[PDB]
Design a protein around this ligand. Structure first.
Ligand SMILES: C=C1/C(=C\C=C(/CCC)c2cccc(CCCCCC(C)(C)O)c2)C[C@@H](O)C[C@@H]1O
Ligand SMILES: C=C1/C(=C\C=C(/CCC)c2cccc(CCCCCC(C)(C)O)c2)C[C@@H](O)C[C@@H]1O
Lengths: 239, 9, 239, 9
């Protein structure tokens, strides 16, 4: 069998959205506070993440159905899922060869130790890299990569969400698209969909661990002052 | 959430 | 006549404090978000000012008497006077030759138009440069420059101050030091002290105009998100 | 004023 028009244009507008919000040249990185190698890397990685939050909002605004949600639910989904979308999108720059994120040149090549200099520990970073390796080993299509991020964005089991029926519905329609894509357009993808859903579960525990270490970071004023207003707002505990 | 609200138009 | 020991060590510890918190090489500027020439210069000048706020706190902590004040009064004085101390200290990089602030190289040479690209207007910038020219034309000693900043810091007519008697006392003792310094150690300074006190009045109206344009800036989220936590806190209206 | 308080020790 084959995909329907509606599933097709969902794929189209999603792939187009990722292209509009992800720069493979990483040319905007020179605009960040430069990297330094206590917590020397925090200003750069804070600028990097803040920039990424903005891009995630752009992507989300183009996910079919997201714009129709209430502003509250839009925020609640964005706040809870952000760091996971960041982790998901960051796979595009991750290299299996040197176990790092390569983003333009040697200044913007980020190894595990760089994130250590941002206030984070191996309790987050080793399952992080573990996650990145497994995800990269799936060799996802651009359609599958973009669907997965949209699946994750529209997860109904987030703190703060209200219309858990409408959000579960959008996510289910998105999941239908993915199942269908793998079956029809991905040879030897007999098991891929299951592996991808599992990757969402991994993100949840990655999210939790980051939220713990960030909460540590944000409670110390000498460190929280190195963050950005956007980062503080999105990862902050205000309702 | 002033920033987020603005960014979401 | 001559200066007393106590007036002398007030001068000494003040000059030492300015040296510890002002880098004539401006080498930390490469750590800021780079300058760009809507509101392209805002990230750099926000990083610049935030950095400067930190340096002003360092200076203030070494002003004899400031540390003994309550934390509340310390904040209240710091919040209200900050931008004036910034304007005062920035004279060291101001050049009469090109009417600009030269801070290391051509990237960090700031003309009036650069600040325009930070969200400010000529209603602030032309009395600003007007102020800088007159101050530079005084050709202050390092002792007089450092005393003036400490005079300004300990002004008792600020919003929020409580112990206006103790703060007026410290400022008066500082003023005594200045009057004495000019008389004894500054030839042809017959009128300088009066001119300097007038420069404090100019700062008040400069402060007011900046506070208006900043309030405009801070109310727009797309602009306030480009500021720093420290800037937002110090120039913000919270009590 | 969390930041300012910390910076003032
Ligand atoms: C953000 C991106 C990139 C790398 C991301 C990475 C990899 C390392 C640069 C990353 C992602 C998520 C979490 C983490 C761990 C650190 C958390 C952020 C720091 C704060 C906000 C203070 O907690 C790192 C680089 C490119 O792939 C663009 C992509 O959007
Ligand atoms: C801050 C310093 C320097 C230049 C300062 C300058 C000159 C121009 C770089 C200045 C000073 C005060 C006010 C203004 C006007 C712009 C206000 C700040 C922008 C915000 C915070 C968004 O309102 C400019 C450069 C060096 O002299 C160090 C000094 O501490």
């Amino acid at each position: 069998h084959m995909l329907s028009d509606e599933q097709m244009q969902i794929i189209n507008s999603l792939v187009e959205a990722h292209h509009k919000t992800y720069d493979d040249s990483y040319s905007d990185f020179v605009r960040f506070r430069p990297p330094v190698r206590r917590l020397s890397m925090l200003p750069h990685l804070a600028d990097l993440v803040s920039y990424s939050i903005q891009k995630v909002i752009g992507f989300a605004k183009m996910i079919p159905g997201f714009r129709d949600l209430t502003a509250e639910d839009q925020i609640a989904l964005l706040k809870s899922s952000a760091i996971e979308i960041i982790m998901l999108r960051s796979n595009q720059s991750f290299s299996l060869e040197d176990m790092s994120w390569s983003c333009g040149g040697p200044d913007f090549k980020y190894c595990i130790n760089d994130v250590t200099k941002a206030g984070h520990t191996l309790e987050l970073l080793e399952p992080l890299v573990k996650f990145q390796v497994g995800l990269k080993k799936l060799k996802l299509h651009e359609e599958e990569h973009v669907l997965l991020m949209a699946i994750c964005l529209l997860s109904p089991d987030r703190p703060g969400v209200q219309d858990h029926v409408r959000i579960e519905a959008l996510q289910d329609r998105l999941c239908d698209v993915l199942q269908a894509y793998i079956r029809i357009q991905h040879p030897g993808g007999r098991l891929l969909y299951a592996k991808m859903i599992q990757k969402l579960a991994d993100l949840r525990s990655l999210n939790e661990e980051h939220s713990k270490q960030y909460r540590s970071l944000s409670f110390q004023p000498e460190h929280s002052m190195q963050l950005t207003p956007l980062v503080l707002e999105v990862f902050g505990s205000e309702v | 959430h002033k920033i987020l609200h603005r960014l979401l138009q």
